[PDB]
Amino acid sequence: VDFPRSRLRFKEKLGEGQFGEVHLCEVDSPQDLVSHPLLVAVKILRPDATKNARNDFLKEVKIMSRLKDPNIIRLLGVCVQDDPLCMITDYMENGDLNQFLSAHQLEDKAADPTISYPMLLHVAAQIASGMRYLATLNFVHRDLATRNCLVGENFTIKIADFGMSRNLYAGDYYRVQGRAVLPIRWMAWECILMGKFTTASDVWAFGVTLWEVLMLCRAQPFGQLTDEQVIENAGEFFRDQGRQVYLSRPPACPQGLYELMLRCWSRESEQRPPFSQLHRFLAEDALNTV
Numbered sequence: 318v319d320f321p322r323s324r325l326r327f328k329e330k331l332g333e334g335q336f337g338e339v340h341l342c343e344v345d346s347p348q349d350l351v352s353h354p355l356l357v358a359v360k361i362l363r364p365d366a367t368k369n370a371r372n373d374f375l376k377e378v379k380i381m382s383r384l385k386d387p388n389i390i391r392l393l394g395v396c397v398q399d400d401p402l403c404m405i406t407d408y409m410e411n412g413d414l415n416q417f418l419s420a421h422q423l424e425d426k427a428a429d430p431t432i433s434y435p436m437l438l439h440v441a442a443q444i445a446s447g448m449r450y451l452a453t454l455n456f457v458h459r460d461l462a463t464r465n466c467l468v469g470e471n472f473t474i475k476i477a478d479f480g481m482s483r484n485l486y487a488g489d490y491y492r493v494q495g496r497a498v499l500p501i502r503w504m505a506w507e508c509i510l511m512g513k514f515t516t517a518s519d520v521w522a523f524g525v526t527l528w529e530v531l532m533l534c535r536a537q538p539f540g541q542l543t544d545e546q547v548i549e550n551a552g553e554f555f556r557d558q559g560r561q562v563y564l565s566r567p568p569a570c571p572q573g574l575y576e577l578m579l580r581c582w583s584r585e586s587e588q589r590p591p592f593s594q595l596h597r598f599l600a601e602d603a604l605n606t607v
């Protein structure tokens with residue numbers, strides 16, 4: 318689908334991704350789009366966009382064009398050849414999952430918006446389903462975290478990617494001059510030591526994302542340890558002498574679900590559960606832990 322920027326009406330800035338800024342737009346005659354007025358999210362180049370940023374933007378279009386799953390952000394169209402570049406996606410009206418969940422507390426069984434434990438499972442299950450789909454494409458996300466998930470109506474979740482440069486989440490990334498930026502607290506030990514990312518390291522990051530969800534996004538993973546201590550913990554996984562440490566069991570997390578999380582952090586990549594198995598546990602098995 319090709320869409321004219323003239324037929325868009327820009328309403329407010331939603332945030333920024335790695336290679337452009339995102340705006341909420343209205344559409345009056347939304348016939349062409351793949352899917353009162355229709356609301357969509359539109360990514361455009363920054364006003365100081367370089368030749369390199371445009372190149373990275375065009376490649377993002379290509380990557381996005383194949384993502385077709387209910388729990389992955391979906392490209393509805395792009396702007397026409399003569400227009401300035403743009404990408405159009407669905408508008409997730411509740412925004413960032415980290416910020417959204419941070420605004421809730423776990424419902425008190427006995428006696429300010431709240432969220433139930435079964436709804437936490439439903440949020441986690443949708444992320445697992447989206448990751449299951451990505452694994453079928455042999456697509457490695459490399460930065461799964463609640464800050465990269467979006468929330469629509471009725472707690473529908475879409476996995477997206479905002480990149481690593483937003484100020485709000487700067488503390489979630491480890492920066493060294495001349496090196497790739499690294500979300501080390503979400504990274505499997507072999508990613509930290511060897512810089513290589515696989516579906517099995519996405520499973521590790523899903524474990525941390527699940528931990529985030531059960532913490533209601535109120536705490537950074539390994540939050541009381543320094544970046545240097547988190548990196549040294551990867552060495553303790555490598556050496557395999559029983560000195561490595563794990564994220565602790567969240568109060569909202571029953572032991573059966575926590576043992577699933579621990580399996581995501583297995584030293585051996587092949588022993589980590591596939592997303593097909595994680596999805597089934599969260600959608601079914603975990604229901605007898607309510």
Ligand SMILES: O=C(Nc1ccc(Cl)c(C(=O)Nc2cnc3[nH]ccc3c2)c1)c1ccc(NCCO)c(Cl)c1
Nearest residue numbers: 331339358359360380390404406407408409412477478
């Ligand atoms: O999400 C990716 N690109 C993308 C494009 C266009 C838009 Cl408009 C958006 C977007 O943020 N939309 C949106 C919708 N509702 C909202 N409500 C509140 C904020 C807000 C934002 C995002 C992306 C990029 C690279 C990837 N992989 C490449 C790197 O490995 C992957 Cl998997 C995904």
Ligand SMILES: [Cl-]
Nearest residue numbers: 539540541542
């Ligand atoms: Cl800690």
